Structure 1
Amino acid sequence: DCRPPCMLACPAQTDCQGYVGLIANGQYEEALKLIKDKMPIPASIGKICPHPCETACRRELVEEPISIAQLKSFVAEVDLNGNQYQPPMKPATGKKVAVVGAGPAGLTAAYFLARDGHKVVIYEAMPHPGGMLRYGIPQYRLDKALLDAEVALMTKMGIEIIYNTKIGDDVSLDYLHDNYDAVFLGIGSWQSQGLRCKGEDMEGVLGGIDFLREVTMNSNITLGGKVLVVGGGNTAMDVARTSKRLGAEEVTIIYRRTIDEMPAEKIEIHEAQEEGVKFQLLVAPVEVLGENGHAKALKCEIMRLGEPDASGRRKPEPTGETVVYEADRIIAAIGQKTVIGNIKDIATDKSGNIIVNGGAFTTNRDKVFAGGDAVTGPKIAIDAIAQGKNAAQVIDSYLNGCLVPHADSQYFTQKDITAADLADRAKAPRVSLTVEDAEVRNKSFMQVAKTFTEEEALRESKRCLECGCRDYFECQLIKYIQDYDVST
């Protein structure tokens, strides 16, 4: 194994084994120096990531795997509370790059472009930076002060962020095209899908994204007693629990597939179940019933389980039974869709996403690049971070006069490792997370989980198996294999 499975499963290819081992040696600053080579906001990402790296950990063949994300968040918070690290920058090259949007993709592109000596300016359409990490992730999951502190650390490097400026509506894109050496569009997907049923325009039906944004900006909202959330993704879960904390006496989640086929994380579903939101299952929208312009009932059909699809989830089948559900507010949280807005001369696909040349992140307009949810649609944050970093590298290469596309690397991998190969290893229980009781969670917006202590972090990090090759950074066989384009 040239590189461990945990690093290869991560979208950003963050060296999980290296900084887990550096934590096990008590070097927290070096662990953060390892992490910050791939993202500028390690604490938030460690707090919210669904950790695909943790699924592929070979410690699963013995017991529960290594809590990689918690260790990352612990080290990031320990450095934020101590001496803040600023990575070195190349001398200034005089090039100007404008980044549209301050989400994870835009922030990562600006970080890795300013680290190469260029001067970067971020245009943001909202009063505060963060994107959907700020206006879509609730406070009880991601503390906004942490994100503000990280963005302040980034701003200390010399990156100018201009707020309340919307491209297309306030500043034209031709202005940025004329006045800058490169443009990177990280606009993201900010349009709520409708119920796609009759009477979806009735007053009293609102989008999940707009409701969450109004919650974040501390605006005046109306919820009432009964709230019905339609959808099964992370948006439905966040909206349901936010409405539970906002004084709603009962919240109902409506979906078409089984609990086992929910696209949300099992931990979030279990936390929502403990908090008190009731799940209503195997149900799809039919008709919204309202009187005098006010909606009070939702009519639906009852489905039944069917054959699994190609994605591994059982297809719903109709049954012909109708049921109506009383409500005071109905929130549609089916999913997000990309909107281009008033930006013109940019090609978009059938679903609204920006069309780019694969591997080079180039749109139809020259000097304009794109990445993040504007290309891949709604996905997790680490995917946006990876796309932003790769696009920053491609833009930096383009500014030098020769554009080179991004291409993956070849490694030796081993796929015959089973539990019988790890029968000699000792077993050590995983570190449990201390979660606040369901009494205080239901009424308050404070954090539901606490960060690892130093003792817990050492105990968890000293449990890794060191799956990767120790000679990778000096092996010459892999060097010639990469250099001479030989498949492994």
Structure 2
Amino acid sequence: VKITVNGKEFEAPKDKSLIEFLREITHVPGFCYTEAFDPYGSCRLCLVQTPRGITTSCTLKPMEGLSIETLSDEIIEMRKTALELILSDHYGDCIGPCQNGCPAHSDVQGYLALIAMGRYHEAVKLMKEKYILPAVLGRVCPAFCEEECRRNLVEEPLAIRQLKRFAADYDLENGPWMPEIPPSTGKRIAVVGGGPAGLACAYYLRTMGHDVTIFDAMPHLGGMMRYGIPPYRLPKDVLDKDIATVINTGIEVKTNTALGKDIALEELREQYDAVFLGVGAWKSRKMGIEGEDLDGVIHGTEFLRKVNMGEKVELGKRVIVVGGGNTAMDVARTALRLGADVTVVYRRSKSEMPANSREVEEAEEEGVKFMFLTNPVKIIGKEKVEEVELIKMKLGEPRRRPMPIEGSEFRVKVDNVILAIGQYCDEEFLRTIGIEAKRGRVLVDEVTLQTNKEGVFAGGDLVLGPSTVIESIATGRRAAIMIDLYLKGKLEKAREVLLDPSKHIEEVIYDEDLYRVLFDLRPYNHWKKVTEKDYEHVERKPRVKVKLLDPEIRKSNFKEVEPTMDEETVLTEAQRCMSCGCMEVFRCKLREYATLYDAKQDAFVGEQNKFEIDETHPNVVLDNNKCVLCGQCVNFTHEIAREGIVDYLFRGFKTYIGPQLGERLEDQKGVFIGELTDICPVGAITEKLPFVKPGPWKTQPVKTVCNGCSFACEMNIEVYNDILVRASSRKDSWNGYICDYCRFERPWAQDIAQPILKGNAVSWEDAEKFLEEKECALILTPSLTNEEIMFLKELAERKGIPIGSTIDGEGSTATLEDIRNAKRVLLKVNIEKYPLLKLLLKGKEIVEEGYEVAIIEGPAEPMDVPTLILHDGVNATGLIKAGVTGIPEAKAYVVIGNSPAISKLKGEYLILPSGLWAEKEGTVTNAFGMDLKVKKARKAHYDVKSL
């Protein structure tokens, strides 16, 4: 039959549900559908518009001439309302608050877990995805991620900045991590400004393909990282190494080539595809009082760049500094080291100080005098500054903008005045380049960050004024995203989608770039309204302290105040993480649908059920707070597994999915409890990963098979850069499911480390001596792929060595289709030993006579009826072509792999290791005689064929 969907003529099968075909052609959300069971209408998300009204596509079978509207306004409204209803009951955090607090929004939890595991290069690799210069940020960043960490609700926020500094230093010293550069996109980008924003824009446009050219006035890169932040906070060799990490990606650096003095912005646009203005705010804002022209009045930024560049600045004993930003702190602690008595003046109170708080505390330790709630009025002196009159300030209620008191006459005799009121870019330069700005801050659209001149983007201190390194890097990354979007002509649709994607859902689905931009910039994060009472059960762990240089010796040298933490305390500090983010954040479909449909958590608010988490099982967690009640786990365990692990309990708003009253998941005697982790779509049933910190990583599945028994079930191994995380089930696998033995005992993730010689873990030299000295026979365990078997057989043939195996027999004339179609079976093997037979033989006649098919245990002889013979080796059907036969009864043996039948051998035996199963590539033959591919998750450390 043929149907019309959204006005386009389509051909669809008549028996299958419409949701399959529709999901093939368009985006149809839905939780509670799978082909294994009958259609379920428990989520109501697959709605379509039909002539009879709105109805669910999973229950719709195609009918002739049916018109389907998948994305009408009413359908979007209904799906958005349904998602908001579901989110009103959802409980959990998609990401940790550490990622939300970071202006770059970096995966803090993941690289903390990687630091706990000891893989510092991988932690730095995860850091690089959101921001550049992790060592610089580990030294200077104000640590916005620790402001709202969930460990603030227990004892103390995690040392994210210090652990990041340790990992970045380890990566800098022990071989830097450099990303992979995609092939050239043919576009060149010009960046004006060598600061953090320019470096971030250049790095993230280089990692996309476009070649980047950086224009910087000063001879060095870093901008105010080099000529701003003083060297006792950020050593310049560390900065050289970090900027080298950025620049080795292929960014051509043009220094002493300034915009407005060497090239013009019109010519810059004419000669380049796109331009980013990260020129910073290098001009210092004059305070605006009488007598500012007196000798001895200098600007804070000019003073700092004079000190950093290695020039002589004439500084007296008594210095007053005006400002409250980081600039005032750096000029204060730099003038203190030069031999002055420095005071800092600020209009507002201590808590409103934009400066980094730890730097304020350190300056208090070093002896910097702070004046808060005061401001200068005029600078008194004949020609040089001798005294400045201030007025005490008090900011009343309206913002609370400061307004001075009527009169106090704060007159202080001082030798130098240093102005650090703020920063801006020159208004004359901004006007002469035709770039609009207000008060020196460039005017741009908030989303696109694009100026009034087409092709020109801006960010950093130029746009945000008094910003930080991380905020400038975030603006630069956003500008790289927008420059890539503008280069492929998608900037306007992207702007509209980022404003509201629920109006352009088809365009979001159609273009992968819009999907990526939506999920990178505007993702739906579910948030938990937590307080101190929700973390009363965790064990208090102290935060590690790094010893600073002594304040008295600190106030007289330009040496680094804070060192990198010890390697011994790194694991202890990284194991205090509570893993607040959802373990299924990268796979949860509720999050994806709420991102696509612009669902709000606050739309419908009210009672939600609070469930305790069922972690009592050895390897499976059941969190009913994240349950959307699709019933797929219940349908599996009661229809296919036929184990009855869990079921619906109670009805209405109080419904949940639990084992039974009075028992938890540990007491259940099922062998398919680990399949429910792949069954659940919204992270309610999850798997306990064996690592110390399982912090979710964007893993990649690899197609391989299991080696638990001769079934050799196809499965996906989830890998995160050579980490073997977990085993999952593929939809395109003939079995479709894997058993708990394979998942949790992990026969694919273990082997024997050393060759075995009568229970002795001898080295390979002794094993080679044993092999060469004696003419042992070659015995093969069935845990080797077909290529390994062929290689060993060919070696034995050309070297004239008898060849054998731990198992002998023949048969297996039954295919999977025969087991499916036959009605009567003969059961001799123990069912519990082979768990897939539970699913394959469900609802079939088990008889002793007249059987159509039989299951027998190796060694066995094939019968006239289609027979299944089950060995205990994955490639035990490797004898169907090689004819490797059994033990040839020789003197001493070399056997590749460990089997219980080794004890049956007569004489001393050398057990060669068969290698790690997950590291092998080849084809295997299972019981049903189908050739299944095995692929490597990681690189093979040692090879069996080369032994």
Match of 1:460 in 2: 573
* Contact 2:285/2:422 (8 A) holds in 1: yes
- 1:341 to 1:106, Cα distance in 2 relative to 1, 3 A: farther
- 1:482 Cα deviation (Å)? 1.8
Q: What TM-score, normalized to structure 2?
A: 0.50
Q: Distance in 1 between matches of 2:408 and 2:466?
A: 33
* Contact 1:255/1:283 (8 A) holds in 2: yes
Among 449, 452, 470, the residue aligned to 1:361:
449
Q: Distance in 1 between matches of 2:277 and 2:352?
A: 34
Match of 1:328 in 2: 415
Match of 2:460 in 1: 372
Match of 1:126 in 2: 218
- 1:366 to 1:416, Cα distance in 2 relative to 1, 3 A: closer
Q: Distance in 2 between matches of 1:234 and 1:412?
A: 32
Identical positions, percent: 46
Q: What SS class does the counterpart of residue 319 from structure 2 fall into?
A: strand
- 1:65 Cα deviation (Å)? 0.9
- 1:357 to 1:469, Cα distance in 2 relative to 1, 3 A: same
Letter in 2 for 1:417: V
Q: Distance in 1 between matches of 2:274 and 2:179?
A: 23
Q: Distance in 2 between matches of 1:446 and 1:71?
A: 21
2:478 equivalent to 1:478: no
Letter in 2 for 1:369: F
Among 392, 395, 399, the residue aligned to 1:310:
399
Match of 2:274 in 1: 182
- 1:316 Cα deviation (Å)? 5.2
Cα-to-partner distance string for 1:442-480 (whole Å, 9 max, x where unaligned): 110000011112222111110010001001111222222
Q: What SS class does the counterpart of residue 438 from structure 2 fall into?
A: coil
Match of 2:247 in 1: 155
Letter in 1 for 2:375: A
- 1:2 Cα deviation (Å)? 0.9
Q: What SS class does the counterpart of residue 274 from structure 1 fall into?
A: helix
Match of 1:98 in 2: 190
Cα-to-partner distance string for 1:78-99 (whole Å, 9 max, x where unaligned): 0000111111111112111111
- 1:424 Cα deviation (Å)? 1.3
Q: Distance in 2 between matches of 1:282 and 1:169?
A: 41
- 1:228 Cα deviation (Å)? 1.1
Name whichever of 200-209 and 358-367 sits farther off. 358-367
Letter in 2 for 1:362: Q
Letter in 2 for 1:426: E
* Contact 2:94/2:527 (8 A) holds in 1: no
Q: Distance in 2 between matches of 1:259 and 1:2?
A: 35
The total of aligned residue pairs comes to 483
Letter in 2 for 1:296: E
Name whichever of 416-425 and 137-146 sits farther off. 416-425
* Contact 2:524/2:592 (8 A) holds in 1: no
- 1:127 to 1:319, Cα distance in 2 relative to 1, 3 A: same
Q: What TM-score, normalized to structure 1?
A: 0.95
What's the RMSD between the two structures over aligned residues?
A: 1.8
Letter in 1 for 2:152: E
Q: Distance in 2 between matches of 1:20 and 1:309?
A: 43
Alignment of 1:49-198 (within 5 A): 49-198=141-290
Match of 1:48 in 2: 140
Letter in 1 for 2:179: P
Q: Distance in 2 between matches of 1:121 and 1:467?
A: 40
Name whichever of 61-70 and 350-359 sits farther off. 350-359
Q: Distance in 2 between matches of 1:259 and 1:127?
A: 37
Q: Distance in 1 between matches of 2:323 and 2:111?
A: 38
Q: What SS class does the counterpart of residue 300 from structure 1 fall into?
A: strand
Q: What SS class does the counterpart of residue 307 from structure 1 fall into?
A: coil
Among 367, 387, 390, the residue aligned to 1:297:
387
Among 542, 554, 564, the residue aligned to 1:451:
564
* Contact 1:96/1:118 (8 A) holds in 2: yes
Q: Distance in 1 between matches of 2:600 and 2:254?
A: 46
Letter in 1 for 2:526: T
Task: State the structure with bigger RCO (CA 8 A, min sep 6), 1 or 2.
Answer: 1
Q: Distance in 1 between matches of 2:485 and 2:525?
A: 28
2:361 equivalent to 1:258: no
Q: Distance in 2 between matches of 1:279 and 1:5?
A: 33
Cα-to-partner distance string for 1:119-175 (whole Å, 9 max, x where unaligned): 111011001100111111111011111111122222222110011111011111222
2:374 equivalent to 1:287: no
* Contact 2:285/2:420 (8 A) holds in 1: yes
> Larger C-alpha radius of gyration, 1 or 2?
2
* Contact 1:126/1:164 (8 A) holds in 2: yes
Among 317, 325, 338, the residue aligned to 1:225:
317
* Contact 1:23/1:458 (8 A) holds in 2: yes
- 1:340 Cα deviation (Å)? 5.0
Among 39, 47, 52, the residue aligned to 2:131:
39
Q: Distance in 2 between matches of 1:228 and 1:306?
A: 22
Q: Distance in 1 between matches of 2:234 and 2:99?
A: 24
- 1:323 Cα deviation (Å)? 3.1
Q: Distance in 2 between matches of 1:77 and 1:285?
A: 43
- 1:8 Cα deviation (Å)? 0.9
Q: Distance in 2 between matches of 1:149 and 1:309?
A: 48
Cα-to-partner distance string for 1:31-62 (whole Å, 9 max, x where unaligned): 11100111221110121111111011111111
Among 307, 314, 325, the residue aligned to 1:215:
307
Letter in 2 for 1:287: K
* Contact 2:265/2:433 (8 A) holds in 1: no
- 1:386 Cα deviation (Å)? 0.7
Q: Structure 2: which 5+ residue stretches go unaligned? A: 1-92, 499-517, 602-947
* Contact 2:186/2:210 (8 A) holds in 1: yes
- 1:68 to 1:87, Cα distance in 2 relative to 1, 3 A: same
Q: Distance in 2 between matches of 1:460 and 1:158?
A: 36
* Contact 2:103/2:471 (8 A) holds in 1: yes
2:365 equivalent to 1:274: yes
2:438 equivalent to 1:346: no
Q: Distance in 1 between matches of 2:147 and 2:566?
A: 23
Name whichever of 56-65 and 339-348 sits farther off. 339-348
Q: Distance in 2 between matches of 1:98 and 1:246?
A: 39
* Contact 1:123/1:165 (8 A) holds in 2: yes
Q: What SS class does the counterpart of residue 191 from structure 1 fall into?
A: coil
Letter in 2 for 1:270: E
2:94 equivalent to 1:6: no
Q: Distance in 2 between matches of 1:75 and 1:341?
A: 44
